[PDB]
Every structure is written in C-alpha cells, then in structure tokens.
Amino acid sequence: SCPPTKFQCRTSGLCVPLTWRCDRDLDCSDGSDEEECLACLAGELRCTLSDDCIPLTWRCDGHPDCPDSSDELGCG
Amino acid sequence: EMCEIPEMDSHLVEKLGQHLLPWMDRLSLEHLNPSIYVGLRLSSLQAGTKEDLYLHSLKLGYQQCLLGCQGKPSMGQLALYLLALRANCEFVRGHKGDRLVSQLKWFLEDEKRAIGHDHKGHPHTSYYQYGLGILALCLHQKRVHDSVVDKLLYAVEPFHQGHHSVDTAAMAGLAFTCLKRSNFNPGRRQRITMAIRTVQEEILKAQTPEGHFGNVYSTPLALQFLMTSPMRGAELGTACLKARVALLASLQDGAFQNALMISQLLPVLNHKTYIDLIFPDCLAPRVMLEPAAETIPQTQEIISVTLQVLSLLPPYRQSISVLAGSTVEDVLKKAHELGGFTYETQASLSGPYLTSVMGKAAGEREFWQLLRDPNTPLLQGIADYRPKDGETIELRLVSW
Numbered sequence: 001s002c003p004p005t006k007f008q009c010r011t012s013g014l015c016v017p018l019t020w021r022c023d024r025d026l027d028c029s030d031g032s033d034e035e036e037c038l039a040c041l042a043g044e045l046r047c048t049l050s051d052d053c054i055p056l057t058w059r060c061d062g063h064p065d066c067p068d069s070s071d072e073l074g075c076g
Numbered sequence: 077e078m079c080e081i082p083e084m085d086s087h088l089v090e091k092l093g094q095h096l097l098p099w100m101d102r103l104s105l106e107h108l109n110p111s112i113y114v115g116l117r118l119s120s121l122q123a124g125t126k127e128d129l130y131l132h133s134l135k136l137g138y139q140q141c142l143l144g145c146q147g148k149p150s151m152g153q154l155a156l157y158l159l160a161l162r163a164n165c166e167f168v169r170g171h172k173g174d175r176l177v178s179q180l181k182w183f184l185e186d187e188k189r190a191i192g193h194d195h196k197g198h199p200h201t202s203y204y205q206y207g208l209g210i211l212a213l214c215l216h217q218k219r220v221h222d223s224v225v226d227k228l229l230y231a232v233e234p235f236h237q238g239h240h241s242v243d244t245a246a247m248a249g250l251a252f253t254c255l256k257r258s259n260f261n262p263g264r265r266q267r268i269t270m271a272i273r274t275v276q277e278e279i280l281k282a283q284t285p286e287g288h289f290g291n292v293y294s295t296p297l298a299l300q301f302l303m304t305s306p307m308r309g310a311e312l313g314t315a316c317l318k319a320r321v322a323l324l325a326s327l328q329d330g331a332f333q334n335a336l337m338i339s340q341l342l343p344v345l346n347h348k349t350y351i352d353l354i355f356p357d358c359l360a361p362r363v364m365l366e367p368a369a370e371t372i373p374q375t376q377e378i379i380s381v382t383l384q385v386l387s388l389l390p391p392y393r394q395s396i397s398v399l400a401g402s403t404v405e406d407v408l409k410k411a412h413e414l415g416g417f418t419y420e421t422q423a424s425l426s427g428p429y430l431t432s433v434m435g436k437a438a439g440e441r442e443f444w445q446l447l448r449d450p451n452t453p454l455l456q457g458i459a460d461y462r463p464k465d466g467e468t469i470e471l472r473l474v475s476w
C-alpha cells in the first residue's frame with residue numbers, strides 16, 4: 001500500500017525505510033520490521049573497538065556513547 | 077504562594093488550537109515542528125489521528141537526516157524532538173536513539189568549550205538552546221557532567237556577565253528544575269536550588285505595569301517556569317493573576333498568531349508545563365479540534381508602507397503599496413518585485429527568519445533587527461507583523 005524501498009509496519013499501516021529493516025531497533029509498533037527480513041584531543045578517550053573519541057566526562061555517565069558501549073562497560 | 081492561572085474560556089482556548097490545526101497537515105521537513113506537537117499534547121485539545129502521523133513524520137525526518145534531507149534539523153530542534161518523544165510517553169531508545177542522544181551531548185560539549193573556562197566566550201547558539209538541551213536530556217533521564225551545568229549556573233548566578241532575556245532565564249529555570257526533581261548533578265544540588273530562586277526573582281522583577289513578564293511573548297514560558305515550584309516570601313499568586321489579566325487582554329486583541337508562541341502558551345492554559353514531561357499523562361482526555369469553518373473575505377483597501385534600510389550604502393528607502401492586512405514579508409516581496417531590493421530568509425520553528433538584506437548577510441552575533449516608527453523593535457517576525465497604513469518598517473543590522 002506504500003512505496004517500494006520502504007517496509008510497511010503491518011499493524012500500524014505506516015511505512016518505514018529498509019535501512020531500518022532488520023536493524024535491531026523496534027521502529028514499528030508491530031515490531032514487524034525486525035523478525036520479518038587520528039589522535040584524540042586532550043581530555044578525551046578512545047572507544048575500545050572503534051575510531052571514536054569521547055570526552056573523559058562521558059565515562060560512566062549512564063549512557064553508552066561508544067558503539068561498543070565500552071565507556072560504561074568498565075563501570076560496575 | 078503558588079503561581080495559578082485559573083481556566084480561561086473554552087471558546088477562547090479552542091480558537092488558539094484552531095490556529096495550530098492547519099500545521100498538522102504540513103509534514104514537509106521545512107515545516108515539521110516538534111514544539112507544535114508538544115504544545116498540543118500538553119494542552120486540553122487534540123487533533124486525533126493526525127497527531128500519530130505527525131509524530132511518525134518527525135521520527136522519519138529527524139532520524140534519517142541526522143543519522144543517514146533538505147536543510148536537516150539543528151541540535152536545538154533535536155532537543156525539542158526529544159520533548160516530543162516524552163509527550164508520547166516514549167524514552168529515546170535503540171541504537172538510533174542512543175546516537176541521537178550523544179549528538180545532543182556533543183552539542184552541549186561544544187558549546188561548553190566555546191564558552192570557555194573563563195566564561196567570556198559566547199555559545200555559538202544561545203544560552204536558551206544550551207538550557208533547552210540540558211532539559212531535553214534530563215527529561216529522558218540522560219545525565220550531563222557538572223562542568224556542563226556550571227556554564228548555565230554561572231550565566232544566571234550573581235555577578236554574571238551579559239544580560240539574558242526572560243525567555244532565556246525561564247528556559248534555564250526549567251532545566252534546573254528537571255535536574256533538581258531528577259536528583260541529577262548532586263554535586264551542584266545547592267547551587268541548582270539557589271539558581272531556581274534566582275530565576276524566580278529576576279522574572280518577577282521583569283514584570284511590566286501591564287502584567288506581562290518582559291513582554292507578551294515571554295509570558296508563556298515565564299509562566300511555565302513559575303508554575304513548577306512554590307516561591308515562599310514572595311507574592312507569586314498576585315504576580316501570576318496580574319499576568320493572566322495581561323494575557324487575557326492580549327489574547328482578546330489577537331496577539332497570538334504564531335504557531336510556536338501558541339504551542340508555548342497552550343500548556344499553561346491546561347495547567348501544564350514542560351516539566352510534566354518527566355511523568356507524562358498521555359491518556360488524559362482532550363477535546364477534538366475541528367477545522368474552524370470560516371470565510372476569508374479579501375480586503376478592498378490599499379495601504380502604503382515605507383521600507384528602509386540604513387545599514388547599507390547606498391541606503392534604501394521606498395514607499396511600498398500592499399493590500400491592507402499584508403505582512404512585513406509581503407512588503408519585502410513587493411519591494412523585490414519593484415526592483416532594487418533583495419533579501420534572504422531561512423526556515424525556523426518560529427517561521428521565516430530574515431538572514432540577509434540586499435546582499436548583506438548577518439554574521440557572528442549579528443542579526444537583522446525589525447523596527448517600526450519610532451525606533452521600536454517589532455515583537456513579531458516578518459510573516460506575522462502586519463503594518464498599518466503609513467507605517468515605516470526598518471531593517472537594521474545590529475550586533476548583540
């Protein structure tokens with residue numbers, strides 16, 4: 001019912017992009033989209049598994065700012 | 077005493093909501109407005125199924141543009157999108173959500189760096205957006221470092237540098253209130269508590285003899301903040317009743333046309349504020365808004381407005397004829413059509429923002445100020461202010 005290259009959330013009837021198709025996020029209310037298919041600056045720290053730098057103050061702040069969540073993994 | 081605004085006439089509230097209603101069908105990214113969605117959800121009014129489509133459009137636009145668009149949204153607008161999520165009883169979540177959060181955190185970190193350890197440097201945007209960003213993160217229970225909060229604290233605390241509007245102070249106060257209610261930044265708890273009282277006092281001391289806080293368009297946000305906490309020792313009740321009187325007069329005189337302004341006022345009229353987004357009540361009953369059946373008589377009268385720009389050499393000064401009821405923007409269009417005048421605007425949540433005049437764009441900490449005679453700054457933008465016959469409108473490049 002909706003344009004090709006966009007998945008349609010079946011219960012909602014709403015239409016969402018394929019990038020979001022099988023991408024671990026629940027973008028549809030019906031969750032149909034899922035089962036259906038460099039130096040760091042001073043004061044910054046590098047994410048363990050990637051290129052990314054975050055400020056030191058983002059360590060242990062309750063939110064995963066690193067792709068691998070390594071900035072909160074150490075905290076325990 | 078408490079800041080209470082007794083319920084206004086339902087008819088009067090309804091006609092405010094009907095001004096918002098046409099925007100529910102304008103889903104293009106240049107027109108998408110998270111503040112409109114928030115204001116409506118916090119109001120006593122609703123647009124039914126249109127709301128769900130509106131939120132869906134917001135989610136599509138903001139997530140694709142910022143993670144994957146014509147003039148994608150700003151970080152300040154991303155903050156308001158976060159408020160929109162709370163208005164639907166959602167927490168920002170998933171991998172796409174986490175990334176959006178960190179982008180907003182980067183915005184705050186960059187502004188902190190721009191301000192500096194000394195606090196002389198300005199933010200690249202305003203302290204209003206700085207406060208809005210802290211609030212938005214706090215509403216989703218996302219924490220910011222004490223060093224980030226410190227810049228907002230210093231901006232309002234005694235012996236602070238610069239001068240902030242009522243709007244900016246109110247937004248700061250809302251951010252401080254969310255931090256305090258969430259027990260965030262406990263190492264700044266006493267200063268946060270003191271800052272809230274400071275903002276209260278400065279807003280009360282900014283009340284005009286008419287009853288507005290600062291001006292008619294600062295009053296809505298000011299009231300939102302004042303409603304969130306008691307103010308012992310002060311006569312907050314009296315001040316707020318006087319504001320209601322001022323607000324009522326302004327409403328009956330058609331002051332509130334702009335959709336963003338209405339979206340900031342509607343929560344107040346429903347006894348709600350942005351702080352109600354900590355524990356949202358999404359299923360509270362709201363009256364369905366129907367389109368105002370309403371004729372559109374054209375005027376028959378011609379008016380002439382003088383447009384002038386003295387900020388450029390050679391200066392511009394021309395008498396422009398338009399239909400009565402035309403906006404400043406209509407005058408600008410007509411001037412452009414007559415030849416010898418150009419200008420540029422950019423989209424914002426408040427509507428078209430004037431960025432350039434006759435080839436001259438506003439630079440850092442500069443803007444094109446709108447004035448009427450004599451030397452009186454407009455309280456509305458080019459698309460909302462409707463000049464009277466014989467008026468002189470000036471565009472003036474100023475530094476702030």
Ligand code: CNC
Binds near residue numbers: 156244
């Ligand atoms: C900061 C600020 C504020 N301003 Co100015 C003030 N003082 N503003 C802007 C500043 C922007 C620059 C900057 N670096 O931040 C500043 C000082 C240059 C600006 C300009 C003035 N402002 C003005 C007014 C009247 C509006 N502004 C407010 C939005 C008043 C705001 C207060 C409020 N209650 O909202 C305000 C405190 C916060 C806006 C914000 O950041 N929102 C959050 C952001 C995420 O949303 P946004 O849509 O993307 O923000 C953009 C727009 O707001 C645009 N913009 C700013 N003001 C306006 C006004 C209009 C009418 C339009 C269409 C766009 C803007 O600037 C922002 C981009 O940085 C408004 C409530 C303020 C008020 N209480 O009087 C009012 C607006 C009243 C209304 N009926 O809509 C001016 C028209 C004054 C004048 N006579 O010239 C003028 C705009 C002229 C123009 N060139 O078009």
Ligand SMILES: [Ca+2]
Binds near residue numbers: 021026
């Ligand atoms: Ca998905």
Ligand SMILES: [Ca+2]
Binds near residue numbers: 059060064066071072
């Ligand atoms: Ca973190």
Ligand SMILES: [Ca+2]
Binds near residue numbers: 331332334460
């Ligand atoms: Ca207006």
